[PDB]
Amino acid sequence: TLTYDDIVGTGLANKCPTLDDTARGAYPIDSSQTYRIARLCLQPTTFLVKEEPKNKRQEAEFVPTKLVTRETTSLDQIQGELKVNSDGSLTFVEEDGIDFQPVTVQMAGGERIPLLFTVK
Amino acid sequence: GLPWYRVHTVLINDPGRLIAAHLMHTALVAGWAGSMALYELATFDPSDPV
Ligand code: CLA
Ligand code: CLA
Ligand code: CLA
Ligand code: CLA
Ligand SMILES: CC1=C(/C=C/C(C)=C/C=C/C(C)=C/C=C/C=C(C)/C=C/C=C(C)/C=C/C2=C(C)CCCC2(C)C)C(C)(C)CCC1
Numbered sequence: 001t002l003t004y005d006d007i008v009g010t011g012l013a014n015k016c017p018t019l020d021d022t023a024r025g026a027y028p029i030d031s032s033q034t035y036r037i038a039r040l041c042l043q044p045t046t047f048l049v050k051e052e053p054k055n056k057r058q059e060a061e062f063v064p065t066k067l068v069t070r071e072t073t074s075l076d077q078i079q080g081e082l083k084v085n086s087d088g089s090l091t092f093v094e095e096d097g098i099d100f101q102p103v104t105v106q107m108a109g110g111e112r113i114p115l116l117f118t119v120k
Numbered sequence: 121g122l123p124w125y126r127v128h129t130v131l132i133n134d135p136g137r138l139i140a141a142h143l144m145h146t147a148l149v150a151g152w153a154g155s156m157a158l159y160e161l162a163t164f165d166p167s168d169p170v
């Protein structure tokens with residue numbers, strides 16, 4: 001439905017695919033059939049950064065941080081074979097896609113923490 | 121000649137130039153007030169309140 005001239009600028013291009021409240025279904029895994037994942041998307045929402053130890057070994061926590069970049073965070077187009085090995089468990093193997101994005105978040109104090117948000 | 125330590129006597133009966141004077145003192149104390157603040161914000165470390 002929505003196209004490029006339809007999404008351009010809305011920043012919808014960063015948020016990825018939703019499922020209207022109808023879900024809760026069940027995708028039958030055949031085991032006698034090979035499954036793959038067409039498109040695996042990972043849309044960042046919150047980034048936390050464990051406060052560098054105080055030196056005083058007293059459980060450091062993950063504090064929230066401000067996103068200093070823009071809406072340049074999502075991972076998409078990720079694909080690979082969803083292998084169905086014995087004992088019914090599924091195993092996804094990442095093959096290729098836009099599986100990494102350099103993100104920089106400004107932390108509580110003042111710092112700027114650039115990380116390579118990825119799932120390579 | 122008026123002595124140096126009296127120069128400011130020229131206001132004992134000039135409610136205008138007195139309010140003007142007093143206005144300048146206040147203005148300076150505010151300057152300093154925020155002035156100090158900035159100096160401290162430019163050097164205060166908030167990393168550990170313990
Ligand atoms: C509440 C504030 C206050 C105010 C408005 C006045 C006002 C006045 N005083 Mg008084 N005085 C005060 C407090 C005050 N005084 C205090 C606390 C003392 C005890 C130290 C005195 C001792 C005093 C004397 C001994 C004399 C006056 C005189 C005078 C009159 C002329 C001043 C003058 O010529 O300055 C001009 C002054 C200078 C050119 C020199 C300033 C030099 C100082 C050491 C530099 C410090 C600078 C720094 C920026 C100040 C910061 C202030 C600090 C409190 C934060 C004037 C009506 C004179 C008078 O009666 O004349 C007939 C006089 O002879 N005063
Ligand atoms: C209507 C009532 C009234 C009010 C509310 C005031 C209020 C004030 N007087 Mg004034 N006064 C009055 C009547 C009044 N006076 C009368 C009838 C006389 C005899 C002529 C005086 C003589 C007098 C002297 C001799 C002095 C004062 C001073 C001051 C100020 C001291 C505190 C200060 O500096 O805060 C710091 C400032 C603020 C944070 C407030 C800023 C906001 C103000 C209210 C608005 C200014 C804009 C407004 C349109 C015009 C000024 C109005 C004027 C009535 C104050 C304060 C604003 C002193 C001064 O000159 O102050 C520097 C001083 O030396 N007064
Ligand atoms: C309620 C508190 C308060 C009070 C009562 C005063 C009162 C006064 N201030 Mg200060 N002021 C204050 C807060 C206060 N201030 C704050 C928070 C600041 C911001 C830092 C200032 C900044 C300030 C400035 C920038 C100036 C004043 C000046 C003055 C004096 C103006 C009237 C005068 O002619 O004195 C006549 C003079 C005196 C009696 C001052 C001597 C008294 C002090 C306590 C001595 C300080 C010692 C000094 C370090 C020694 C130097 C010695 C020299 C030989 C080298 C008056 C004594 C003016 C001034 O002093 O100019 C003449 C001036 O220029 N004030
Ligand atoms: C417009 C209003 C206004 C406001 C809301 C503020 C607010 C503030 N000021 Mg600023 N300030 C102002 C005007 C103002 N200021 C002006 C005009 C000046 C002079 C230029 C300053 C100069 C100034 C300085 C130098 C400093 C502040 C500071 C501060 C901060 C709190 C400090 C404090 O505890 O003070 C509490 C103040 C008092 C104890 C005042 C009460 C005085 C006595 C007890 C009463 C005398 C009353 C008299 C006898 C009448 C009788 C009373 C009757 C009811 C019985 C606060 C954010 C401080 C700060 O942190 O800086 C960023 C600081 O150091 N201010
Ligand atoms: C020309 C013009 C005009 C006017 C002007 C004016 C109004 C001015 C003012 C001015 C001013 C008003 C000035 C001031 C100055 C100041 C100064 C010069 C200061 C200094 C300071 C200092 C040096 C300090 C120090 C410190 C330190 C170091 C630390 C601690 C704290 C403190 C802060 C204390 C107008 C607009 C009409 C328009 C046209 C043009």
Ligand SMILES: CCCCCCCCCCCCO[C@@H]1O[C@H](CO)[C@@H](O[C@H]2O[C@H](CO)[C@@H](O)[C@H](O)[C@H]2O)[C@H](O)[C@H]1O
Pocket residue numbers: 109110111112158161162163
């Ligand atoms: C329109 C109204 C304007 C009102 C005035 C606002 C001015 C705000 C200035 C506040 C004072 C800042 O003071 C300044 O803080 C920054 C951190 O944030 C410090 O920055 C320090 O840590 C950062 C990392 O976090 C380093 O990259 C920097 O090299 C180091 O100096 C400065 O060394 C200090 O001098």
